[PDB]
Amino acid sequence: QMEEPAAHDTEATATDYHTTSHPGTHKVYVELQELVMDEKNQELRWMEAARWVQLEENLGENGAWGRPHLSHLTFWSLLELRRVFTKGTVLLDLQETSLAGVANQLLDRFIFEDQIRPQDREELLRALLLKHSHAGELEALGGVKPAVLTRSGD
Amino acid sequence: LPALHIAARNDDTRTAAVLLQNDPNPDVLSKTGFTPLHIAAHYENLNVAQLLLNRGASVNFTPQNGITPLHIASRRGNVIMVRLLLDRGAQIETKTKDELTPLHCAARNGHVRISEILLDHGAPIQAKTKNGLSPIHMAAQGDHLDCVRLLLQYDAEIDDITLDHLTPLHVAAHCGHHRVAKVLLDKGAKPNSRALNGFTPLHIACKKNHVRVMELLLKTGASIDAVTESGLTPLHVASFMGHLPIVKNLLQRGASPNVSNVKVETPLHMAARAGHTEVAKYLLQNKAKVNAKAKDDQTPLHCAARIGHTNMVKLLLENNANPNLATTAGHTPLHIAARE
Amino acid sequence: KWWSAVVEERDAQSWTISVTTPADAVIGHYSLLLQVSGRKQLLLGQFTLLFNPWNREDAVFLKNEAQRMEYLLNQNGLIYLGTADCIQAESWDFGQFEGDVIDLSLRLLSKDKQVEKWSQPVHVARVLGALLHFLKEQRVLPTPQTQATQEGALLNKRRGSVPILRQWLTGRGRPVYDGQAWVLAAVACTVLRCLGIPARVVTTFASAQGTGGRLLIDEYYNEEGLQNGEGQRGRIWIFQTSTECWMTRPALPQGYDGWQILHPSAGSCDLVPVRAVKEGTLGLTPAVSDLFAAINASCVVWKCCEDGTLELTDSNTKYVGNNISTKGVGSDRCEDITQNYKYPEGSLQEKEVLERVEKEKMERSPLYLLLKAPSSLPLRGDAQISVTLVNHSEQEKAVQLAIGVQAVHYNGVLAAKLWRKKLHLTLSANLEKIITIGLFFSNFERNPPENTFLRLTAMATHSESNLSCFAQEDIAICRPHLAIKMPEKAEQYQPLTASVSLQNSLDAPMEDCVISILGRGLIHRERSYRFRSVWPENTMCAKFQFTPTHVGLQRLTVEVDCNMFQNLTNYKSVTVVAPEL
């Protein structure tokens, strides 16, 4: 068999990639999406849940946005965020224009640090490229429910 | 129409668009006879090239010269024009008045990529113009190295000749390019190959005074001793042309001034026919018998007397050639000195 | 011709305005202002204005299109190193179209304070050449005298041009030691490709950089066959890089458009057209004489002795300024443009120009040898060399033959004394005699440095006559070959599998084998992989998988490091096409 090598990190050559251009200051608009599946056909899709223009504004099951309000979290969220960000994967100054390239480079960087197994690359690349609906289509969909992926894709 | 070509030169799209909206003539001849497509191929204006090729612009529309637009586009070297003209249809194998193929014009200027594309599209590598020169011979003339490498890599018969039997080594030594000589040597060649005159490439290098080519040929192993069909030697050619450093190198690396031609003549005899002085001193310095007889037994004083050169004699008198010596006819250096 | 704007398309809530530009305008950051009769003037945005070799009436204009696409739009270049006998390409990345190059270049330019003379490329080119030579003289550190092999993997690896530009302007990265000072030309080319001036990087092997105005170079050699002492005012370098830019000369008399060499002087720079170098006109520009002296000048060699008296020696003549080469257009092969710099040697024309320039400057052996040596020598290996000797004298003669081998940097700087051998011979009866001798690396005295070239010298001293014969040759060191297997065409957004093969030709097992892959537009930044020990008999074979993203023509590079050697680079090209709809 052709023996595949192991990974190795060396930061001797990192400083040759530090840009000097000032990016500036910019305001932000945050959007959160998660995997769900609609009832008429067993098809997974990404659905938005809330926005953060000024305050957290959530999306109800009827499809109507509520009132803005302050952002309160839970302790398990912050604990797991610190734990998973301590061993997370970063990609700075990526040169892309379409989501497929970002997905492919992110998957390759995942494979490099042994986050996931190589035989799962196909399933995640199929997952991350589904269509992304919006608020107008929900009443056309008739409702959506949480949908976790499976190896066979069902 | 003398201005349609001006619109082609400036890539004036709308003017030519109106001119072909009204007029139905897609090709007219100038006084020279070149079509608008020929002048479009020169200045590389391709929007009008598309406009012409949309209607009636025959790619194989040869005047009495026979110069296709593809020939000019390969001449000046425009790549995208070659791809466009070949995509719309082109007959590669054509002839000019001088029967020049597009590969011929491509090889002469030095554009290597056009040659790659054309040889990919089925142009025959082996060919013979009016004389019979292959494209590798012409590209070897213009000192285009990587074109020689490309023609060798795809396909080339190296030891090809023409009507005057000329290996590419011969034209390389006649035009003074040692760089292509290196490639032709290490890939494959024969220094022993002789022309119609019977000349080695060493003889041509001795004639046209290129030195580095001589060094490469002798480091390969072209023989010092060689006989031209006249009967000469490279030492004799170097003496008759008046090149001193070639004589120096050839006499250092092992040579004999004592050599006889079909008429028995030393390089002293072969030198005093023109009177190069320093080559005479250098040949006399090494072992050469100045007391010698020619075909009619003329001494080198006899051959020197017809020149009228004064100080050439005293150097010959340094090795005391006697004026007692005379030819078969009885003539003496005094006799020829009074005759001339 | 002058600044203009037309309102071509009109909507009830929109205008489409077409701004046009004059052919001769100052480049830099502009700003658009709109002033109606009533209101204050309003800022509309910002833009930048550069040169275009596509316009016919502009000065810096290229007729052919493929020359434009190679010399202006390309980013993945080659730089040729090694001796003139074996030329080794090295992959280089200019990266002129990065984000920060334009603003950095304009900030470097704006230290001139002569604004109106920015409309012309001559002034910009001269100023930028002077500034970049000054910065190179500022920020380049000399080599560490102590031996650090464990950090030699980091001292001499190059990633491109843009990190060096950043480290020269701000000084927040890795420095560039004197071992690689030839990057400057490439850097300048980067700046010109940023600004709109087409440019390329040429390499002259065996150039006479040093003092100029004199067509003669002296070199001193030891009794044993080495070079006593270090340095000289004018020496023959192994190679030298320079920069060519394409423009038109209006200030000169008519007939000098085209390629020009950029020449900084020890600071005021200037540029000289190549046809001036070929024709030999010294008085056209003060820099032409030194550059023409830099291409075709001849050397004489002196012999030092124990008494201190110097002696002239009869040696074989060596050539200067041969095998001028650069990157070919539209491909990945070398092409020599050397016909643009010299006439063929020994023509009537070159003899004419030599006699004319010498006339203008006037106003201001019974035995010999010759040497056959190979053009390339394997690492941890051996080779054979041969010296012949021919005498011309009826009497027998005794001779002492010495052979010296030593490594040298690329600028003639001596590095280490390696080997010498002395023997006695007796030639008789005017017969030639050949001596063939092997050269093994195990017989050496020291390990050579990272980037050196060996100089092999031979000196035959006649016992009777003090006049001695001499010969020298240069040999580059070759490293084992690195095979890259990869298909020619690939589909976008698809997996692609490359293979890498290496054979341990060397006699030592490799340890700590660390390889790295990178490439612009293929992999994001840089990847590293580790391996087991490689025995001298066995090979290694590895496989990687990635996915192309940007359509067109790319190339990837691999780089191998181990304990025996560092920074072994290679490359391979690929054409990726858009997916079928």
UniProtKB/Swiss-Prot annotation, chain A:
Changing E11K: Found in patients with hemolytic anemia; uncertain significance; Montefiore. The modification Phosphotyrosine is found at Y17. Changing G101R: In SPH4; Fukoka. It is found in: Cell membrane; Basolateral cell membrane. It comes from the Eukaryota. It is linked to Ovalocytosis, Southeast Asian: An autosomal dominant hematologic disorder characterized by ovalocytic erythrocytes that are rigid and exhibit reduced expression of many erythrocyte antigens. Clinical manifestations include mild hemolysis, intermittent jaundice and gallstones. However, the disorder is most often asymptomatic. Spherocytosis 4: An autosomal dominant form of spherocytosis, a group of hematologic disorders characterized by the presence of numerous abnormally shaped erythrocytes which are generally spheroidal. Affected individuals have anemia, jaundice, and splenomegaly. Clinical severity is variable. Some individuals are asymptomatic, whereas others have severe hemolytic anemia requiring erythrocyte transfusion. Functions both as a transporter that mediates electroneutral anion exchange across the cell membrane and as a structural protein. Component of the ankyrin-1 complex of the erythrocyte membrane; required for normal flexibility and stability of the erythrocyte membrane and for normal erythrocyte shape via the interactions of its cytoplasmic domain with cytoskeletal proteins, glycolytic enzymes, and hemoglobin. Functions as a transporter that mediates the 1:1 exchange of inorganic anions across the erythrocyte membrane. This is Band 3 anion transport protein. The lineage of its organism: Eukaryota, Metazoa, Chordata, Craniata, Vertebrata.
From Swiss-Prot, chain B:
ANK repeats lie at residues 1-28, 32-61, 65-94, 98-127, 131-160, 164-193, 197-226, 230-259, 263-292, 296-325. The modification (3S)-3-hydroxyasparagine is found at N60, N258, N291. Isoform Mu17, isoform Mu18, isoform Mu19 and isoform Mu20 are expressed in skeletal muscle. Isoform Br21 is expressed in brain. The modification Phosphoserine is found at S256. Regulated by phosphorylation. The 55 kDa regulatory domain is involved in regulating binding of SPTB/spectrin (beta chain) and SLC4A1/erythrocyte membrane protein band 3. Component of the ankyrin-1 complex in the erythrocyte, composed of ANK1, RHCE, RHAG, SLC4A1, EPB42, GYPA, GYPB and AQP1. Interacts with a number of integral membrane proteins and cytoskeletal proteins. Interacts (via N-terminus) with SPTB/spectrin (beta chain). Also interacts with TTN/titin. Isoform Mu17 interacts with OBSCN isoform 3/obscurin. Interacts with HIF1AN. Interacts (via ANK 1-5 repeats) with RHCE; this interaction mediates the primary membrane attachment site for ANK1. Interacts (via ANK 1-2 repeats) with AQP1 (via the N-terminal). Interacts (via ANK 1-13 repeats) with EPB42. Component of the ankyrin-1 complex, a multiprotein complex involved in the stability and shape of the erythrocyte membrane. Attaches integral membrane proteins to cytoskeletal elements; binds to the erythrocyte membrane protein band 4.2, to Na-K ATPase, to the lymphocyte membrane protein GP85, and to the cytoskeletal proteins fodrin, tubulin, vimentin and desmin. Erythrocyte ankyrins also link spectrin (beta chain) to the cytoplasmic domain of the erythrocytes anion exchange protein; they retain most or all of these binding functions. This is Ankyrin-1. It comes from Homo sapiens. The chain holds residues 174 to 513 of 1881 of the full protein.
Swiss-Prot record, chain C:
The keyword Translocase does not apply. Transmembrane segments: none annotated. It comes from the Eukaryota. It is found in: Cell membrane; Cytoplasm, Cytoskeleton. Changing R200C: In SPH5; Shiga. The modification Phosphoserine is found at S161. One of its GO terms (cellular component) is plasma membrane. Signal peptide: none annotated. Keywords: Cell membrane, Cell shape, Cytoplasm, Cytoskeleton, Disease variant, Erythrocyte maturation, Hereditary hemolytic anemia, Lipoprotein, Membrane, Myristate, Phosphoprotein. Its main location: membrane. Both cAMP-dependent kinase (CAPK) and another kinase present in the red-blood cells seem to be able to phosphorylate EPB42. GO terms for biological process: cell morphogenesis; erythrocyte maturation; hemoglobin metabolic process; multicellular organismal-level iron ion homeostasis; regulation of cell shape; spleen development. GO terms for molecular function: ATP binding; protein-glutamine gamma-glutamyltransferase activity; structural constituent of cytoskeleton. It is a lipid-anchor. Component of the ankyrin-1 complex, a multiprotein complex involved in the stability and shape of the erythrocyte membrane. Component of the ankyrin-1 complex in the erythrocyte, composed of ANK1, RHCE, RHAG, SLC4A1, EPB42, GYPA, GYPB and AQP1. Interacts with SLC4A1 (via the cytoplasmic domain); this interaction is mediated by the SLC4A1 Band 3-I dimer. Interacts with ANK1 (via ANK 1-13 repeats). Interacts with AQP1 (via the C-terminal). The substitution of an Ala for a Cys in the active site may be responsible for the lack of transglutaminase activity of band 4.2. It is linked to Spherocytosis 5: Spherocytosis is a hematologic disorder leading to chronic hemolytic anemia and characterized by numerous abnormally shaped erythrocytes which are generally spheroidal. Absence of band 4.2 associated with spur or target erythrocytes has also been reported. Belongs to the transglutaminase superfamily. Transglutaminase family. This is Protein 4.2. It comes from Homo sapiens. The lineage of its organism: Eukaryota, Metazoa, Chordata, Craniata, Vertebrata.
